[PDB]
Amino acid sequence: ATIGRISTGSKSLDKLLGGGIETQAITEVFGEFGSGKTQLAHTLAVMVQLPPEEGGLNGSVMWIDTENTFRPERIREIAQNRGLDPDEVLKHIAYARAFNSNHQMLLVQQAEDMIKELLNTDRPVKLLIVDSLTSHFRSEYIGRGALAERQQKLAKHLADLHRLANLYDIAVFVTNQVLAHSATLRVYLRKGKGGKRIARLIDAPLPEGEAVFSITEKGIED
């Protein structure tokens, strides 16, 4: 399948990304608390449901939430301000809370069942969010080595996510609060002056430069 691209809602961020986040890829956003990672997730969960002429893929969403940060209210706000029916947008997001890192891992296998169900329908899964990818792993496991449980488990988790992205033509979007080179694409996000958010690609020798955007009632915008 050709690579599809989901607009972020910001023309600046989209240009930085070459049109939007890609299917058959893991895009990892990382940054400090308050940098807008979860806002970008909420925005993408709406944007992907738009038709391609408006920057979406007419797609469904699956969302694995490890910090209790998914907000249906925020989805409804973004949806109505982007011309969609909030009821429909919520209906096409399949949501699960991950209890711990082991449950988070199992949820990826659970997700595959519904990805297969929807694969040849009018609304296939096009976006899988894991927010936060790493919070449970960092809380539960202390050791840094390749042989340590944290790395072994996270490596398997990331390989599982990769597999889904490429097998089923899905954009996988994950967040990480500040191994490191696993994601197809790493984006560093920070909060700058006047509530502006600034994005930079990390180790992607794609456009040099930085995107700037705002958090608004439309999710994100220039």
Binding site: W63, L90, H92, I93, A94, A96, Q110
Partner: peptide
Amino acid sequence: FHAA
């Protein structure tokens, strides 16, 4: 998973 459940609808949101």
